Structures are given as C-alpha cells and as structure tokens.
Design an enzyme around this catalytic site. Structure first.
Site, mmCIF file in Angstrom:
data_model
loop_
_atom_site.group_PDB
_atom_site.id
_atom_site.type_symbol
_atom_site.label_atom_id
_atom_site.label_comp_id
_atom_site.label_asym_id
_atom_site.label_seq_id
_atom_site.Cartn_x
_atom_site.Cartn_y
_atom_site.Cartn_z
ATOM 1 N N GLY A 12 0.819 -1.208 0.000
ATOM 2 C CA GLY A 12 0.000 0.000 0.000
ATOM 3 C C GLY A 12 0.845 1.247 0.000
ATOM 4 N N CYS A 50 -5.381 3.991 -1.636
ATOM 5 C CA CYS A 50 -5.364 5.331 -2.214
ATOM 6 C C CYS A 50 -5.316 5.289 -3.741
ATOM 7 C CB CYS A 50 -4.170 6.097 -1.679
ATOM 8 S SG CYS A 50 -4.163 7.810 -2.188
ATOM 9 N N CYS A 55 -8.026 7.921 -2.646
ATOM 10 C CA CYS A 55 -7.723 9.309 -3.043
ATOM 11 C C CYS A 55 -7.684 9.503 -4.546
ATOM 12 C CB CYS A 55 -6.378 9.750 -2.478
ATOM 13 S SG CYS A 55 -5.713 8.653 -1.245
ATOM 14 N N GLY A 123 -0.095 -12.586 2.726
ATOM 15 C CA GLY A 123 0.905 -12.867 3.721
ATOM 16 C C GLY A 123 0.199 -13.237 4.988
ATOM 17 N N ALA A 189 -21.816 9.235 6.772
ATOM 18 C CA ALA A 189 -21.672 10.685 6.790
ATOM 19 C C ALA A 189 -20.345 11.100 7.417
ATOM 20 C CB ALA A 189 -22.835 11.324 7.534
ATOM 21 N N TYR A 191 -15.910 11.362 5.818
ATOM 22 C CA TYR A 191 -15.288 11.805 4.559
ATOM 23 C C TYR A 191 -15.747 10.976 3.348
ATOM 24 C CZ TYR A 191 -10.981 8.878 5.673
ATOM 25 O OH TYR A 191 -10.097 7.845 5.970
ATOM 26 N N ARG A 217 -18.316 13.176 12.280
ATOM 27 C CA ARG A 217 -17.847 12.989 13.669
ATOM 28 C C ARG A 217 -16.323 13.108 13.749
ATOM 29 N NH1 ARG A 217 -20.224 11.224 18.141
ATOM 30 N NH2 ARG A 217 -22.044 10.750 16.824
ATOM 31 N N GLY A 218 -15.821 13.935 14.651
ATOM 32 C CA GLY A 218 -14.394 14.096 14.790
ATOM 33 C C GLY A 218 -13.876 15.400 14.235
ATOM 34 N N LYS A 306 -6.899 -2.384 15.957
ATOM 35 C CA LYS A 306 -5.685 -1.617 15.690
ATOM 36 C C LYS A 306 -4.471 -2.243 16.366
ATOM 37 C CE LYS A 306 -7.730 1.970 13.549
ATOM 38 N NZ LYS A 306 -7.433 2.388 12.179
ATOM 39 N N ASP A 325 -2.592 2.854 8.432
ATOM 40 C CA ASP A 325 -3.972 2.918 8.902
ATOM 41 C C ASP A 325 -4.214 1.987 10.051
ATOM 42 O OD1 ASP A 325 -4.330 4.694 6.820
ATOM 43 O OD2 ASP A 325 -5.901 3.496 5.816
ATOM 44 N N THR A 334 -2.907 8.994 3.725
ATOM 45 C CA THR A 334 -1.836 8.478 2.870
ATOM 46 C C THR A 334 -0.473 9.104 3.125
ATOM 47 O OG1 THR A 334 -3.171 7.584 1.082
ATOM 48 C CG2 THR A 334 -0.990 8.339 0.490
ATOM 49 N N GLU A 468 -5.872 34.490 0.955
ATOM 50 C CA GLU A 468 -5.537 35.798 1.528
ATOM 51 C C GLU A 468 -6.456 36.196 2.674
ATOM 52 O OE1 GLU A 468 -5.886 39.534 -0.617
ATOM 53 O OE2 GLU A 468 -7.213 38.592 -2.065
HETATM 54 C C1 FAD Z 1 -12.686 6.303 -0.553
HETATM 55 C C2 FAD Z 1 -11.389 6.727 0.137
HETATM 56 C C3 FAD Z 1 -10.861 8.012 -0.062
HETATM 57 C C4 FAD Z 1 -9.673 8.407 0.566
HETATM 58 N N1 FAD Z 1 -9.175 9.690 0.350
HETATM 59 C C5 FAD Z 1 -7.962 10.076 0.914
HETATM 60 C C6 FAD Z 1 -7.458 11.327 0.596
HETATM 61 O O1 FAD Z 1 -8.080 12.075 -0.157
HETATM 62 N N2 FAD Z 1 -6.229 11.729 1.146
HETATM 63 C C7 FAD Z 1 -5.513 10.885 2.012
HETATM 64 O O2 FAD Z 1 -4.437 11.285 2.464
HETATM 65 N N3 FAD Z 1 -6.036 9.619 2.329
HETATM 66 C C8 FAD Z 1 -7.260 9.217 1.765
HETATM 67 N N4 FAD Z 1 -7.809 7.954 2.049
HETATM 68 C C9 FAD Z 1 -7.178 7.085 3.052
HETATM 69 C C10 FAD Z 1 -6.063 6.318 2.375
HETATM 70 O O3 FAD Z 1 -6.628 5.371 1.478
HETATM 71 C C11 FAD Z 1 -5.206 5.590 3.398
HETATM 72 O O4 FAD Z 1 -4.818 6.537 4.410
HETATM 73 C C12 FAD Z 1 -3.954 4.897 2.761
HETATM 74 O O5 FAD Z 1 -4.246 4.247 1.508
HETATM 75 C C13 FAD Z 1 -3.348 3.870 3.733
HETATM 76 O O6 FAD Z 1 -2.142 3.235 3.242
HETATM 77 P P1 FAD Z 1 -1.695 1.866 4.004
HETATM 78 O O7 FAD Z 1 -0.411 1.365 3.447
HETATM 79 O O8 FAD Z 1 -1.837 2.133 5.446
HETATM 80 O O9 FAD Z 1 -2.900 0.849 3.665
HETATM 81 P P2 FAD Z 1 -3.356 0.476 2.160
HETATM 82 O O10 FAD Z 1 -3.019 1.545 1.193
HETATM 83 O O11 FAD Z 1 -4.744 0.024 2.219
HETATM 84 O O12 FAD Z 1 -2.333 -0.761 1.844
HETATM 85 C C14 FAD Z 1 -2.626 -2.139 2.171
HETATM 86 C C15 FAD Z 1 -2.497 -3.055 0.938
HETATM 87 O O13 FAD Z 1 -2.046 -4.367 1.378
HETATM 88 C C16 FAD Z 1 -3.084 -5.386 1.043
HETATM 89 N N5 FAD Z 1 -3.149 -6.503 2.089
HETATM 90 C C17 FAD Z 1 -3.980 -6.613 3.138
HETATM 91 N N6 FAD Z 1 -3.699 -7.721 3.832
HETATM 92 C C18 FAD Z 1 -2.675 -8.318 3.227
HETATM 93 C C19 FAD Z 1 -1.944 -9.473 3.473
HETATM 94 N N7 FAD Z 1 -2.254 -10.228 4.523
HETATM 95 N N8 FAD Z 1 -0.932 -9.806 2.631
HETATM 96 C C20 FAD Z 1 -0.614 -9.059 1.581
HETATM 97 N N9 FAD Z 1 -1.286 -7.947 1.333
HETATM 98 C C21 FAD Z 1 -2.320 -7.551 2.123
HETATM 99 C C22 FAD Z 1 -4.340 -4.562 0.900
HETATM 100 O O14 FAD Z 1 -5.212 -5.314 0.063
HETATM 101 C C23 FAD Z 1 -3.822 -3.289 0.226
HETATM 102 O O15 FAD Z 1 -3.556 -3.503 -1.164
HETATM 103 C C24 FAD Z 1 -8.991 7.528 1.405
HETATM 104 C C25 FAD Z 1 -9.524 6.246 1.615
HETATM 105 C C26 FAD Z 1 -10.710 5.846 0.981
HETATM 106 C C27 FAD Z 1 -11.268 4.453 1.220
#
Ligand code: FAD
Ligand code: FAD
Ligand code: NAP
Ligand code: NAP
Lengths: 490, 489
Positions: A12, A50, A55, A123, A189, A191, A217-218, A306, A325, A334, A468
């Site tokens: 991710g 993302c 995103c 994994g 309701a 983001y 909320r928050g 968590k 996350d 992200t 501004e």
């Molecule tokens: C609709 C939506 C809009 C968003 N908009 C924003 C935004 O505008 N700006 C912003 O900053 N953030 C935004 N976010 C939040 C953002 O998506 C996360 O903060 C970010 O992607 C988290 O990265 P990560 O590496 O923590 O998890 P992820 O990016 O989810 O990475 C995890 C990856 O590992 C995979 N995985 C899970 N378990 C395993 C396993 N056991 N083995 C191998 N792989 C696995 C998952 O399938 C996924 O592909 C948004 C989220 C959503 C759902």
C-alpha cells in the site's frame, strides 16, 4: 540466517514507501500485496487503497463534478456553451481506471527498478521470523526475514443487516462500477460518505444521504454543518436520524432496483424508498485479524483491531513493525503512511533518529465545497485549553471566480483558532472554499513553526486569491461582530 | 480646518486608510478622479485593482482557464461537442458588471462609514490646503490637519509615434468594446505576460515582443519556464526587439495596424500587422501634477516615487504616502491595503504596529500560474554567498491533468535554503495551478522563519499540488535527476 532483511506485508501507500526507501540502503526486501476480493468480487493491482479505491479515483471523480460546475460557469465568462452538457459514467470511470492502471504498473516497475522482490500473494504469519505466502491460485511458499513491516490497511465495513453484502456497494466497488449508479442512497456521513455523495450528485445523479447521528464525527462540527448545508442547498437530499434495517432486490439490472427500509434513531417510525445503488460508507476494519498474528504474538487491540505501537512504529514484538492505517490512535491518511514508512526505513538501515510527527497533520475533506483544516477543532481547543482562553477569528468570503457566474456568495468560510494563554498560537485552522487543499498546506507548515495570530497578521495577502482571507481575519467570534453581509467593499 | 484627514486617491490604499480612519470618528475625505486614457477611457471609484488591474485581470484569466476546463472535461466523461467558441463582448460585459458593482459598493461603503466622497482631482495649493478640480471644471478649496497621498500610477507609453492614438494599455484592454483579434503584446513583466496569456487562452492569435529578459526582478529560471510554457501552448515570442513605429493601416473595431520593430543589438528590421497592440511597458507615478512643490514634499526626481519613513511619512510631517507611489516598495494591492489600514491605526488608535514589507508573497497569473515568496535563487546567492545556499527542487504533475493526459513535468517547485542558518527557507517558488492559494500559507510559514527540517516534518495533503513542498528531497547541487516520471518509485 534469513531470506530477506525485511518483508513488508501489504503493498500500500505505507508498504511501498518503506519498501522503496529500504532499497536505497541495499538490503534484500520483499513486498507481499494481495487484493482479497470484495463481496461482489472486485479486484485491483499493486498500489493499495489510495491508488485503486481511494484518493486517486476519488479526487478524479471529484474533479469530474467540478468540471461540470466549470461548464456552467463558462457561459458568463463568454463561452458559447449550448444549454446543457450530459455526463457519461462509463467514459469517466474508464479514464480513471486507465490512470489507476498505469499507477499499478508504475509501482510494479518501480519495485523491479529498485530491486525489491514483488510477490502477489496473501501474507500470513506462521511462526517467529516465518511467513506463509498463499499465492493467487492456492500454492504457498514459506519465507523468512530478520524484520517485518505490517502495512495491511483496512477494508470497508458493512452493516450487520441483510441484503447489504449481495446488493450494496462500498467505496471499493463504486470506483470501477461497470454501469452508471443511477439514483443512489449513500449511507453514512464521514469523509467517504459525503465526498461520494458529493461527486455523484455533481455529475448529475439523484443522491440521498442517510445520516445516523452527526455529520463528520471528529471534525469541527460547525464546519461539518456548513458542509451539510452547502450540500443540501446544491441538490443533495438528507435523511436525518435513520439507519437502514434491510436492503432487498426489487430487480436485477445494471443498475438494478433495490428497496431500502430504515428505522429511526429514537422514534419507532419506518421509511421505504427505492434506489438504483446503495453506497455503504460506514467505516473500515483493519486487516489485522487473519494475518496469523497469534503465531508471533503481536498484541492488537481486540475491540478495535488496531495495532498499538511505539513512537517508532514498533509493535510489542521487537522485530515486527506497523505502518499506516492499522496503527492505534493515528491518522488514517496516505501522506502519513508514506512518511511513517519512509522515516522507519531511515531509522532501521540509515541510522536516522528522526521520528514521525503525528501532530497537526493537515487533512482535506473533498466535499463539493471542499473543506481543509489543520490543528484542533473549536470544541477541542475549548476542551483542551479552557473556554474563555480561546479566541476565534473567522469570516465569510467570496471567491472572485464566482462573482461573474454570480453564485454562492457568503458560503465560503475561514477561521483560525487562537490560544490566549500562548500569544494567540493558531492551534486551529479551518477553511471551507475552493482548492481547500492547496490553501491549507502552507499554513500547516506555518503551524509546525508555531504560528501566532500577530505573525499571521504581519503576513501580506496575495490578491485576488481565496487564501488571503487568512491574512486579514479581524472579527472575533467572541466580539459578536457581523461577518455576513457583504460587500466586497468596505 | 475642515477635516482631520484628506486622502488623495480612492484606490486600494486610499479607501483602505479612509475606511479605517472612520472607526476612530474623524472627519475624512476621499478625492478620487480618473484622468482618462489617451483614447479617453473612464471608470468609477475603487482604483486600479478594482477597475483595470487584479479584478478584471483575474476574471479574464479565469475565462482562459475555463476554456482549458472545457477541453479537459471530455476525458472526465462530459459529452462536449468538438469545440466551443468564445465571445469577447459577452465576457467583458460580465467583468464590467462585476467591476460596476464594486464601484457602487465602495461609494456606498464610504457613505455608510460617513467618509465624504468627492469625485475630483486633488492638487495641493499651499500648506494644509488642497484644490479639488471637479469633473466639469469648478474648483473648491479644502483644508486638513493631515494628508494621505495615495494616487498610484498609470501605464507608460513608448517614446515612439502612433502608440498613443493606435495602441492600448492595461487601462483600455479590460473594457475593450470589441474583440481585440490578432494581438501584439509589448513587454514582459506581470502585466505583459498575464495579458498575453489570457488573450491567447480565450483563442486569439498572440505575440509577445521581448526587449531583454522575461520578468526582470523575478527568479530568472522560473521566468524562463513561464516563457517556455507559454510558447509551448501557442504564444509567439519575438526575442530582442523594440517597436519603432505603429501606423494605422485601417480604422475598425478592431482596426488593422502595422508594427515596425528594430533589434536590441543588430541593425535588422521586422514588420507585421496586428488588430491590437497592447503596450505593457511599465507605469509612472501620479506624483508629478499633484502640486507637491506648494507643500514641499520631496520626490525622487528620476523615478517619481515618494521616499517615505518606515511609518509611511513623507519628509513633510503632516503628509503621508501609501502604496504604489512609494519608493523601494512592492506595488501590490494587499500591501497598500495593509499599509493604509495600519497607518490609520497609528495616527488615530495609537497602535505602534508598522507595516512589514519583508517577504511579501506575489503571484504572476500567467497561464501556468507562478507564485513565490522570499528571495530568488540569484539574490539568495548574492545576499548569502554561493555555496551557503542549498536548493531543494522538483517537477510535479497535478492529478487533475493525468486523465486529460497532458502537461506532465511542466509544474515545478523549489525552496531556497540558507546553510548558515539551519536551512531557513529564505526563498519559495512554485509553478503550477492555483499557485496563489498554494503560496499564501507558506508565506505565513516564512514569517515564522520556516526551516527546511520543519518543512520536512510537516505532513503533505494528498492528492494536492502543494504537498510537493513537504517532500523536496533532491538538491540542485546534488545534481540528481528531477524529471522523469513516474508517479511511482
Ligand atoms: C474512498 C477513500 C478516499 C480516501 N481519500 C484520501 C485522501 O483524499 N487523502 C488521504 O491522504 N487519504 C485518503 N484515504 C485514506 C487512504 O486510502 C489511506 O490513508 C492509505 O491508503 C493507507 O495506506 P496503508 O499502506 O496504510 O494501507 P493500504 O493503502 O490500504 O495498503 C494495504 C495493501 O495491502 C493489502 N493486504 C492486506 N492484507 C494483506 C496481506 N495479509 N498480505 C498481503 N497484502 C495484504 C491490501 O489489500 C492493500 O492492497 C482515502 C480512503 C478511501 C477508502
Ligand atoms: C493589469 C494589472 C494587474 C494587476 N494585478 C495585481 C494582482 O493580481 N495582485 C495584486 O496584489 N496587485 C495587482 N496589480 C497592482 C495593483 O493594481 C496595485 O498594487 C494597487 O492597485 C495599488 O493601489 P494604490 O491605492 O496604491 O493605487 P490605485 O489603486 O491606483 O489608487 C489611485 C487612485 O487615485 C486616483 N488619482 C490619481 N491622482 C489623483 C488625484 N490627483 N486626485 C484624485 N485622485 C487621483 C487614480 O486615478 C486611482 O483611481 C495589478 C495592476 C495592473 C495594472
Ligand atoms: C475511512 O472512514 P469512513 O468515512 O468510511 O467512516 P468513519 O469515519 O469510521 O465513521 C463512520 C461513519 O459512518 C457512520 N456509521 C457507522 N455505522 C453506521 C450505521 N450502522 N448506520 C449509519 N451510519 C453509520 C458514522 O456515523 P456515527 O457518527 O453516527 O457513528 C460515520 O458517519
Ligand atoms: C506594473 O508593472 P509592468 O508589468 O507594467 O512593467 P515593469 O515591471 O515596470 O517593467 C517593464 C516591462 O516592460 C519592458 N519594457 C520597458 N520599456 C520597454 C520598451 N521600450 N520596449 C520593450 N519593452 C519595454 C521591460 O523590459 P526590460 O527588462 O528589457 O526593461 C519589462 O518587461
């Protein structure tokens, strides 16, 4: 000893960031990414949430909405637009996917170039320093590493109600929906819920949001309400204080036709309507359950899911780390994950002592009228710093860009929240207006410099520009002064 | 006397000080008068920004952008037909309609705050005595304890022939009663490039005639990038030439004119014909004919600027100067507003707060917008010593452009850091969309003496253009590739 110095579980935003960073220090690195399919079976490539279902597609679809707005405006700026232009869902989601696709492939390339080993597999821990990689077809391989990064993120949660999994979509599904969603109910309701309701409505669809309690909320509740008011005034329907109880297919179709029945939050009353698509945007659970954490004894918060973690992103088990996350009491954003992941690699293999700063991370809700903010909310600064120690300078504004289209005066709103016991430290920053993201960034850096209101005042504005407004925030909330009304000129 | 304060000029600085002085319950008078342009153009209360500056300029910029926006919307799924056309008259009508409400907003605002508005030219006649020549010719004589000179500037012409009777300035463009058609823009600072930019952007055939360098005063590398961008998106550039004569080949709306230009160094001569020639070649202060002799205010004779104390006071203790007419200041609206507003604070409210002229952010609204604040790369080298400067910089691609599939690696950000100072970001620059909004915050961040390591500790907002500044790891000195791109690595 072991096969890799480091195995990152999850490819991710956090995953690939740490991965790509660890590679500068010439170490054997492996990323495992695997996209467990949604209920109705959706898939996607390397990149995480993302990139594929977050995103990236969300912003793009937001832009699509804005661009419709843009077409409307262009008449008054002298563009001889014919009366109404129509939107094509398929054409749109196709371009979005085309960009997502190149991102997927970009990362698979980037890993190869930096010499990281990519393995598209799930994994699951099997024992200390030992992981099982169940690949796409079922075969497993067993790998070992000196250290591990858990970076698996979360996935959309459903309601405990029937019909929902087989008939509703989540964030995960919407962004590749192979048909125009048509009349939609968005449930929830925060983001994701409002953003999505916002862009769906913006591209022309009949959209209703079903709110259980409060909006966002928050986040600063006054801002939240203004976002809600804005959304309602620009054609989004709100059903306040209701939860759905059942979703039943009244037809199959692309889109189908579904019937949503919902109970009240407090009364006994019941409502029925029928929609083409039901969007469930009601939270996300961490993928920490079924990664075999028991077999290596990583402690997780059982209630929430968590992973509690040292200020160095270390789990209770000293060789295992967690990023993004899935972390407890952090921001699920992200750039946070990227930073955390990148700086963690620094510490481990580059001997940097630089920790990750989780304080005052700016965020932006991309509702039709965008909301960007950084620092503490009004209620939370009151709570944290004591009511009459807080001074709030605030004001409405009108983007010059809207004057000629002659719309939406006194909807955009800025405020700074200041600590009187502290030289009026701007401990809170908020803006509801266009390009909220761009506006906020700078001030977030300014907050990291402990910006004071009198410093903010000594900073000259850029004209004519929305941001501004923050250089000339003179009317306090306490003072009671009128902020409307407007004028333009005074 | 009759008044505590008389403000000469109802401009950005004027009305600001005026409206501010009113809080402290004093007899205030604003004199505004719009001396007509050569071809006789007029406008209402509000000054340059309101009538013939930022306001109409940004609006017309936006019109250009909106054309871009229409082009993009196809790939985001909007069933646009093939090409939409632009209507100059419909546009400049809406702009004026807004300008008009601003005029008739300030006139009301003055009335409400009880300031006296007199639409007349102000000329000093003797100590504490001013003559107000109204529009028809009648004069009245007023007195005041203090005076604010806030008269701003007006576009300068070339010392060449045809130019006054046949060309337009900024002053004229923004109410032009007809589509300008094929245009030559002469000059290459903010006004020249901005205008060239929006004219081309709404679909016109535009050429820019550059005497020397682009955007003298601004970081020259950014200036060149702005230039390259403008050229790549269909603006024609005539480098190292000055026009020698402009001759009417026809009358018309638009007419047809013939511009003859000599080289900067060679002997060579060129001729083309355009519909409109836009002269954007500097502006002189309206300090000359305000009867400053009769009260002995010293002015820089060479430049026309009024030298002034760090309290906006001229050499004559009861007389003050605000905004563009000041010497060695920035000629920007928010500056004049701030200066004016804060001066009224000192005089009638006993604030000791001065006006901070340091690190005022600015934005050039060229098609690809350019915002910046602090020192330029050459000037930080000059001020702080070459190898004491470290420059972190990088290209970027606004997510918004990926789907329309255009203009990768055009947008560029850099911070300029002082190694002798904990890497103070003493310089900030960004070339990309919504530059203005991006910069503002960082300008505030600079006033807090932002350091590169503080910038780094600040988390980005994704996906947003401005987040690029949170992760600027490649140095210019380091020589690392910044192109190429990827997206993903
Ligand atoms: C609709 C939506 C809009 C968003 N908009 C924003 C935004 O505008 N700006 C912003 O900053 N953030 C935004 N976010 C939040 C953002 O998506 C996360 O903060 C970010 O992607 C988290 O990265 P990560 O590496 O923590 O998890 P992820 O990016 O989810 O990475 C995890 C990856 O590992 C995979 N995985 C899970 N378990 C395993 C396993 N056991 N083995 C191998 N792989 C696995 C998952 O399938 C996924 O592909 C948004 C989220 C959503 C759902
Ligand atoms: C094309 C253009 C674009 C610009 N874009 C921007 C921008 O994007 N952002 C920005 O910050 N700045 C911009 N500016 C600069 C901005 O216009 C000035 O900084 C600002 O208007 C200066 O305000 P002032 O009060 O100093 O002068 P002005 O606003 O010019 O006020 C002077 C007024 O007094 C009148 N006057 C003159 N002499 C007399 C007299 N003797 N008696 C009575 N009245 C008199 C003048 O006619 C005028 O109405 C732009 C300027 C131009 C020309
Ligand atoms: C990523 O974050 P995200 O935006 O997906 O969500 P999130 O920020 O975790 O919060 C959950 C959102 O969905 C709502 N919600 C949760 N359960 C619900 C239910 N059963 N019925 C209706 N609404 C419900 C919450 O409202 P509440 O504030 O009422 O919990 C909130 O609006
Ligand atoms: C408000 O500011 P503004 O943007 O109007 O102008 P400005 O910033 O005062 O600078 C004047 C601009 O016009 C150019 N210029 C001045 N005289 C010229 C001439 N005779 N021929 C061609 N170009 C000339 C200058 O180029 P130079 O840098 O070559 O002087 C510069 O680009």
């Amino acid at each position: 000893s072991y096969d890799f110095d480091l195995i990152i579980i999850g490819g991710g935003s956090g995953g690939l960031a740490a991965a790509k960073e660890a590679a500068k220090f010439d170490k054997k690195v492996m990323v495992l990414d695997f996209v467990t399919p949604t209920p109705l079976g959706t898939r996607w490539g390397l990149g995480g949430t993302c990139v594929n279902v977050g995103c990236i597609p969300k912003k793009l679809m937001h832009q699509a909405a804005l661009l419709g707005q843009a077409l409307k405006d262009s008449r008054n700026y002298g563009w001889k637009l014919e009366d109404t232009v129509k939107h094509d869902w398929e054409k749109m989601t196709e371009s979005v996917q085309n960009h997502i696709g190149s991102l997927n492939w970009g990362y698979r390339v980037a890993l190869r170039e930096k010499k990281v080993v990519y393995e598209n597999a799930y994994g699951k821990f099997i024992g200390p320093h030992k992981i099982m990689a169940t690949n796409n077809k079922g075969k497993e391989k067993v790998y070992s590493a000196e250290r591990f990064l858990i970076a698996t993120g979360e996935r959309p949660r459903y309601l405990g109600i029937p019909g929902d999994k087989e008939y509703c979509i989540s964030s995960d599904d919407l962004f590749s929906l192979p048909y125009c969603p048509g009349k939609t109910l968005v449930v929830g309701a925060s983001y994701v819920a409002l953003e999505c309701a916002g862009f769906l409505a913006g591209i022309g669809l009949d959209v209703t949001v079903m709110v259980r309690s409060i909006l966002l909320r928050g986040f600063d509740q006054d801002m939240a309400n203004k976002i809600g008011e804005h959304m309602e005034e620009h054609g989004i329907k709100f059903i306040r204080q209701f939860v759905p109880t059942k979703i039943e297919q009244i037809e199959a179709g692309t889109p189908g036709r579904l019937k949503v029945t919902a109970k009240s939050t407090n009364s006994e009353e019941t409502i029925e309507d029928e929609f083409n698509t039901v969007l469930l945007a009601v939270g996300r659970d961490s993928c920490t359950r079924t990664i075999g954490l028991e077999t290596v004894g990583v402690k997780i918060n059982e209630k929430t899911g968590k992973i509690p973690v040292t200020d160095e992103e270390q789990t209770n088990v000293p060789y295992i780390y967690a990023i993004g996350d899935i972390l407890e009491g952090k921001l699920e954003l992200t750039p946070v994950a990227i930073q955390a992941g990148r700086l963690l690699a620094q510490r481990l293999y580059g001997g940097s002592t630089v920790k990750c700063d989780y304080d005052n991370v700016p965020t932006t809700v991309f509702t039709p009228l965008e909301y960007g903010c950084c620092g503490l909310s009004e209620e939370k600064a009151v709570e944290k710093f004591g009511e009459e120690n807080i001074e709030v300078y605030h004001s409405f504004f009108w983007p010059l860009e809207w004057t000629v289209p002659s719309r939406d005066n006194n909807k955009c709103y800025a405020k700074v929240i200041c600590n009187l016991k502290d030289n009026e430290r701007v401990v809170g920053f908020h803006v509801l207006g266009p390009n909220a993201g761009e506006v906020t960034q700078g001030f977030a850096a300014a907050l990291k410099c402990g910006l004071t209101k009198q410093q903010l005042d000594s900073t000259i504005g850029i004209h004519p520009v929305c941001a501004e407004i923050f250089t000339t925030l003179s009317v306090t909330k306490r003072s009671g002064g009128d902020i409307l009304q407007s004028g333009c000129x005074g």
